[PDB]
Amino acid sequence: VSWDSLPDELLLGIFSCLCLPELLKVSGVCKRWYRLASDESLWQKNLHPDVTGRLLSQGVIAFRCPRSFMDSPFRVQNSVIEVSTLHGILSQCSKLQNLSLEGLRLSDPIVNTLAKNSNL
Amino acid sequence: GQFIQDVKNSRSTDSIRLLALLSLGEVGHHIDLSGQLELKSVILEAFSSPSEEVKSAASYALGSISVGNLPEYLPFVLQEITSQPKRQYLLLHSLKEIISSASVVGLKPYVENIWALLLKHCECAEEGTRNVVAECLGKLTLIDPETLLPRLKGYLISGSSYARSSVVTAVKFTISDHPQPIDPLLKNCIGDFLKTLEDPDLNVRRVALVTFNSAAHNKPSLIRDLLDTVLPHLYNETKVRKELIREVEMGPFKHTVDDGLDIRKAAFECMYTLLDSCLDRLDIFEFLNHVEDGLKDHYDIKMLTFLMLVRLSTLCPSAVLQRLDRLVEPLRATCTTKVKANSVKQEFEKQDELKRSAMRAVAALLTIPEAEKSPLMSEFQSQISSNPELAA
Amino acid sequence: DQIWDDLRAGIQQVYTRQSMAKSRYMELYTHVYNYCTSVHFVGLELYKRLKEFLKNYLTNLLKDGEDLMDESVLKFYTQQWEDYRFSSKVLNGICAYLNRHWVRGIYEIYSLALVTWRDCLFRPLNKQVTNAVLKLIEKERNGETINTRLISGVVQSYVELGLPTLTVYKESFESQFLADTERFYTRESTEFLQQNPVTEYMKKAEARLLEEQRRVQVYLHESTQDELAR
Amino acid sequence: PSIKLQSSDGEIFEVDVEIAKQSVTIKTMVPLPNVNAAILKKVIQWCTHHKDDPPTDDIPVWDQEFLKVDQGTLFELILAANYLDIKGLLDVTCKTVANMIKGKTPEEIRKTFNEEEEAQVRKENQWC
């Protein structure tokens, strides 16, 4: 008897209500569970490079970083870090919608991604 | 040379062929081309063309030479009409062109043959062929009317439905705006064409109403003295009948199909046309009650009724004033009705012009100088109040 | 492949204008609901089959009326338009469950039928119909009586296609109609001012304006009211 | 009248049209081979007890006990909610099943509903 025999639309619908930390903790039950947990469903706190990399794996439309300190596919749009981990990971990006950068220096990657950024 | 240009398929465009056909037809209208061969063959070949312009040009030019030499060409096309059924439409069009263009004194001997062919072709399975035959009969009626008008007169006694419809349609084309020598004869014999054949069947009723509308629009003098004996029949035609409504239902969806919408629409068009020149000699109330009845008719008739109300707002305001209480309730229901959900987007916007038209109609009705009475008009919520400024 | 033999004859019965009860309706709805609720988006590959079905059906229906001329193709087009739109609405009601199972011509069953009919309009036949309509208008300007319902059913169709958006209506019909109206009225004024005096020309102009207002308020779109009167 | 209510197990009940008109699909408008009689009758119960249906975690307590007998009842009933296009019942059922999921580690969820990737996902999050 296999209980999992329903379409993923209801799974998305409950993802619309289920808590995000619980979703992240439970992500990894099987290949199907983690494969469908990285879709653009609710991805639209302490920041870490591992956290940033995991966030890059799922589609991002809005950013969230009020005051928390911080230390590849075109799907993702005070803290002072090196350029490589902030803008070098995203060489080009055009669907930006919101940023709160402060205390950083302009360089090649940020200038390049700003030149091609026409979304606001 | 024109023949060679027309027949040479290679390196020949549609425009060149059309111009050559028109030039040949115009040239043959005056001078004789009977001594020149290869004409009929290429003209009949040009009938089978992928472009409708070339087809029309060839059909027009086929009978153009026949005007110059009727005895050689007219029997040929008359026989080709019966022999070949796949091209008889353009042949009939050419015959109509000859009848319109050929001299009456030269066309007199073949009148009997043309009439016999048209009467034999009266009953046909194709509608367009029937219309063309009826038009040809109507145009042929213009010449020597004294001999032939009794013949069409006598077909009303026992003619079939198709025959009666063709007879009623043919007399429609005889009426013209400018005076004609056939005017007294048409005045004297239109009585049975209108009165006696006003309700034999459905299609006959429709064609009779169309003929009456055409006569009223063109020459009101013919029907000026017969309004008294015809108006009650029109008012009867202006009523909805519950035997020709066939409802087709599919799941939760419905599709009403009405057959006598056309008859009611024709009657309403006749009523509208009567205002132009035949408004003085009629009982106004017997028009206004029927206008109120048609106010709740089909969606197509609603706009016509609103236009009639707008026209009557200016003409005879007092009669509208005596009926201002019963002429607004349907107009108030039109501005209040709502459509059921889950309908298509176009079904949402189709009331959006009907309500605007009703708003315009009531605004025009409000222009009567002494229309101070307000039948709960002061009801302007958020949605309805938008329509005033849009109408203005 | 498992269930397509059913949901093919039932969608074939729908496009034949024969009454169907409330039992054959929910069975086809259950077919769509059960196929889409299969294990995993899923259910987006029936769209190609439905589009092919509609395209083949319209291609078959085209052949009979390709040779029709003016005053004949109009009746066929008007008769087919209502049946096609009603069948498309019924099919859209059938695929209500599928209607919200996508996030990404136009991707909607009713819009799919409308777009396929729009592809049925790009052929030269439409031009003929337009010409026919214009001819009818000319007949209405000559004093003859014509069937108004034939024109309106066409005109509203031009409003429906192009997804209110009136791009097709303006590109195909409005501009040509305005051009012929201008030419006809210029010729009429030129031919009338030569013989008859201006006193009769005034009444003729008033009557023509009233007739044009009647036409535009009976069987023409409201958007043409302001331009034509100008 | 009464809208038809049928089942594939030979159970045919009848539902009043007025009481069951709040649901979207009947309002726009039955064979339910994937829906059991008990859940479809509880749909009637909930729709007539909530005439204001919209077109822990803030759920009513009294709406829980009658459907809490095993794991399959709410599953079939939310399948019935997806079929009948009702939003409130689907939302409350999904919230309840999520609350049941919430509370224990993913290993407990795997055991109840029937490792190296777990080692990855445990050591790849900082605010879990």
DSSP-derived secondary structure for chain C: --S-STTTHHHHHHTTT--B-SHHHHHHHHHHHHHHTS---TT-SHHHHHHHHHHHHHHHHHGGGTT--TTTHHHHHHHHHHHHHHHHHHHHHHTTTGGGS-----SSHHHHHHHHHHHTTSSHHHHHHHHHHHHHHHHHHHT----HHHHHHHHHHHHHS-----HHHIIIIIHHHHHHHHHHHHHHHHHHHHHS-HHHHHHHHHHHHHHHHHHHHHHS-THHHHHHH-
> Residue C214 and residue B307: Cβ atoms within 8 Å?
yes
Give the integer Cα–Cα distance in Å for A65 and A51.
13
Spacing of C-alpha D44 from chain mean position = 13
User: Coil, strand or helix: which one is A100?
Assistant: coil
Q: Give the B:D interface size as CB pairs under 8 Å.
A: 5
Report the amino acid identity of residue B139.
Answer: K
Q: Rounded to an integer, what distance in angstroms lies between the CA atom of residue C26 and that of residue C18?
A: 17
* 3 state SS of B329: helix
Report the distance separating Cα C219 and Cα B300, nearest Å: 9
Given a contact cutoff of 8 angstroms between Cβ atoms, the answer to whether C168 and C158 are in contact is yes
Residue C39 with chain D: CB contacts under 8 Å: none
What residue of D is the nearest CA neighbor of C98?
A: D83
> Taking Cα atoms as reference points, which of B48, B45, B1 lies closest to residue B27?
B1
Helix/strand/coil for B73: helix
Whole-number Å distance between alpha carbons of C151 and B261: 15
Q: Give the closest residue to D109 by CA, choosing from A3, A26, A10, A34.
A: A26
Contact by Cβ (8 Å): C91, C11: yes
For C179, residues 6+ apart whose C-beta sits below 8 A from its C-beta are none
Rounded distance, CA B196 to CA B208, Å? 10
What is the Cβ-side half-sphere exposure of residue C95, based on CA atoms within 13 angstroms? Answer: 25
CB atoms within 10 A of CB B253: 15
Output the six-digit token pair for C170.
């303006």
Nearest residue to B351 (alpha-carbon basis) of C216, C155, C222, C228: C222
Residue A11, min C-alpha distance to chain D (Å): 9
CA distance D96 to chain A (A): 10
As a three-state string, the secondary structure of A36-96 is HCCCCCCCCCCCCHHHHHHHHCCCECCCCCCCCCCCCCCCECCCCCCHHHHHHCCCCCCCC
User: How far is the C-alpha of C185 from the C-alpha of C228, rounded, in Å?
Assistant: 12
Within 8 A of D28 by CB-CB distance, chain B residues are 252, 341-342
Hey, which residues 23-82 in chain C have their CB within 8 Å of chain D? 26-27, 30, 33-34, 37
Choose the closest CB to C41 out of A6, A8, A32. Answer: A8
Bridge pairing between strands D13-16 and D2-5:
antiparallel
What one-letter code names the amino acid at B57?
A
- Please give the biggest Cα pair distance in chain C: 83
Q: How far apart are CA A14 and CA D78, in angstroms?
A: 11
Give the integer Cα–Cα distance in Å for B110 and B106: 8
The residue type at C143: G
Burial class (CB in 10 A: 0-12, 13-18, 19+), D8: exposed
From chain A, pick out residues whose CB is under 8 angstroms from the CB of D118: 28
Q: What are the extents of the domains in chain D? A: 1-128
Q: Do C148 and B357 touch (CB under 8 A)?
A: no
Chains B and A, touching by 3 or more CB pairs within 8 angstroms: no
**Does A5 contact C39 at a Cβ distance shorter than 8 Å?**
yes
> Are the C-beta atoms of A23 and A15 separated by less than 8 Å?
yes
Chain breaks in chain C (C to N over 2.5 A) after: 40, 104, 163
Nearest chain B Cα distance for residue D55, angstroms: 12
Closest to B257 (Cα-Cα) out of A64, D49, C86: C86
**First-residue to last-residue Cα distance in chain C:** 60
Residues of D in contact with C96 (CB under 8 A): 25, 28, 85
End-to-end alpha carbon distance in chain B: 65
Mutate to test the interface with D, among B254, B342, B344 (most CBs of D within 10 A): B342
Backbone φ/ψ region at C145: left (φ over 0), alpha (ψ -120 to 50), beta: beta
**Identity of residue B265:** K
Q: Amino acid letter at A41? A: S
Report the gap between the CA of D31 and the closest CA in chain C (Å).
7
Cβ–Cβ of A22/D102 closer than 8 Å? yes
Which residues of C are less than 8 Å from D24 in CB distance?
none
Give the separation between CA B205 and CA B220, rounded to whole angstroms: 20
What technique determined this structure?
Answer: cryo-EM
Q: Can you name the residues that pair with D5 across neighbouring β-strands?
A: D13
Deposited resolution, Å:
2.9
* A23 contact partners, CB below 8 Å, separation of at least 6: A15, A37, A42
Q: Give the three-class secondary structure for B246.
A: strand
